[PDB]
Design a protein around this ligand. Structure first.
Ligand code: HEM
Ligand SMILES: CC(C)=CCC[C@@H](C)[C@H]1CC[C@@]2(C)C3=C(CC[C@]12C)[C@@]1(C)CC[C@H](O)C(C)(C)[C@@H]1CC3
Length: 446
């Protein structure tokens, strides 16, 4: 009823810990865990945040209904300037639950089977630009490549043909909107997320202005996706506006690319640092697929068990979403505490996924940790890179098909090494944590 979580004293009124948290959020929450335990409260920018660390505490957020712990209250200020009005967190959840269902229509094994060859080809094609050896920014390459692979697979060849690698800079500017400043300040700032949204909306308006330029007397008779969004209605029978179609296409491409590009880069550096692990991943390709390395198949991906655990271990140590946030609209109880309405309630996949008391060798990249007892199978919410509950991801399978096919291809193409044994440190500029100085050394494989 009355037992508030312990509060972290700040000697600075109103601001609170906004600077220390924003600067080193993972170190901040781990230090707070040691001192205050799994549930604690602190001020940033005149607002109270309450963090739930470890499986048991995080369960409150993951088990919660949107009416009690509300996502759009927090996320709208972050996503609405990125996607546009009327989609995702700019509408009531029930409306968004209809948009989410629509974007799920192409996410099935039927489609993923087609996806494998598209991605393998785009990867083989893109990397011909890299030659026989060299030192290149693998994060800029994967950011470019995954605009092409995500759009081709999720959006289709029509939209894919209207996009190029330059769209990667637009999507890096959109992703720049996901920051501590956007999370906590009034939305009038010097940065360029705004310029990239208008440019991207324009492209998607001209792709379906072109499809809707035909949509007037045109009845297409070919298996499509893009018709899905143009041909859909809400449960009330109402069709999508051009603005709603546009915002959902921006959003699907962001979901397909922003999450996979950082994860794919990080996995590159984990594999370059562990040469023994990398040669085992390559040898696995030949063990599963054959010495001759013929075209990749969906049914092969499921048997790349070491590469699967390497992606799992990359999402453990460098998940692209480090925090998930809700507004408490109703009193909530956890670990014997009462959270009052108006608290912002957060969980951190990054903190849960390296918690000292659950994970052995917690900072080490060890894909074999999953072949014995581990908190990913042993606990409910210690490993939650794609979330859980009512706001959980719909693209986990697609993300695995995309990263596995790209890295299957890249490991067949090349051998990768660190430059001067430099391992990229974390960039906290945005809340999608990116590798600093992500220049990789490569040479032609075998
Ligand atoms: C490795 C890549 C990905 C990661 C790590 C990831 C992670 C996440 C996380 C953590 C959430 C939960 C957000 C929260 O609870 O506040 C989420 C939600 C979501 N993700 Fe993903 N995601 C990825 C790729 C994708 C892709 C490819 C799509 C679509 C094709 C997608 C669509 C969504 C959707 C629709 C939500 C639901 C938001 C809601 O219901 O409120 N994600 N994702
Ligand atoms: C426009 C439509 C329908 C989009 C569908 C996809 C969205 C729901 C996804 C794509 C990117 C996404 C994973 C994201 C997040 C959640 C769900 C999003 C918005 C959030 C807001 C979760 C909290 C994170 O701390 C952070 C702010 C970095 C991300 C940003 C991307």
């Amino acid at each position: 009823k009355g037992k508030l979580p312990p509060y972290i004293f700040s000697p600075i009124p109103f601001l609170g810990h906004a600077i220390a948290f924003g600067k080193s959020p993972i170190e901040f929450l781990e230090n707070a865990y040691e001192k205050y335990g799994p549930v604690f409260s602190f001020t940033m920018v005149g607002k109270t945040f309450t963090y739930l660390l470890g499986s048991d505490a995080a369960a409150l957020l993951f088990n919660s209904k949107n009416e009690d712990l509300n996502a759009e209250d927090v996320y709208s200020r972050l996503t609405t300037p990125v996607f546009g009005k009327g989609v995702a967190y700019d509408v009531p959840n029930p409306v968004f639950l209809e948009q989410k269902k629509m974007l799920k229509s192409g996410l099935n094994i039927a489609h993923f089977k087609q996806h494998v060859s598209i991605i393998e080809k785009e990867t083989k094609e893109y990397f011909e630009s890299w030659g026989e050896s060299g030192e290149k920014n693998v994060f800029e390459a994967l950011s470019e490549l995954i605009i092409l692979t995500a759009s081709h697979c999720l959006h289709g060849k029509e939209i894919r043909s209207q996009l190029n690698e330059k769209v990667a800079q637009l999507y890096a500017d959109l992703a720049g909107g996901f920051s501590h400043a956007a999370w906590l300040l009034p939305g009038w700032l010097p940065l360029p997320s705004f310029r990239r949204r208008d440019r991207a909306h324009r492209e998607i308006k001209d792709i379906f202005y072109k499809a809707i330029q035909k949509r007037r007397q045109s009845q297409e008779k070919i298996d499509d996706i893009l018709q899905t969004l143009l041909d859909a209605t809400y449960k009330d029978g109402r069709p999508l506006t051009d603005d709603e179609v546009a915002g959902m296409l921006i959003g699907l491409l962001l979901a397909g690319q922003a999450t996979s590009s950082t994860t794919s880069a990080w996995m590159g550096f984990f594999l370059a640092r562990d040469k023994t692990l990398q040669k085992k991943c390559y040898l696995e390709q030949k063990t599963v697929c054959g010495e001759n390395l013929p075209p990749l198949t969906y049914d092969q991906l499921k048997d790349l068990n070491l590469l699967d655990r390497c992606i799992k271990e990359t999402l453990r140590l460098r998940p692209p979403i480090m925090i998930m946030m809700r507004m408490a609209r109703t009193p909530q109880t956890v670990a014997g505490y009462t959270i009052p309405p108006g608290h912002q309630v957060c969980v951190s996949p990054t903190v849960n996924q390296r918690l000292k008391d659950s994970w052995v060798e917690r900072l080490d990249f060890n894909p074999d940790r999953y072949l014995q007892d581990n908190p990913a199978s042993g606990e409910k919410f210690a490993y939650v890179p794609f979330g859980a509950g009512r706001h959980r991801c719909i693209g986990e399978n697609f993300a695995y098909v995309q990263i596995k096919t790209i890295w299957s291809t890249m490991l067949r193409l090349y051998e990768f090494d660190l430059i001067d044994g430099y391992f990229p440190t974390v960039n906290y500029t945005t809340m999608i944590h990116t590798p600093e100085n992500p220049v990789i050394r490569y040479k032609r494989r075998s």
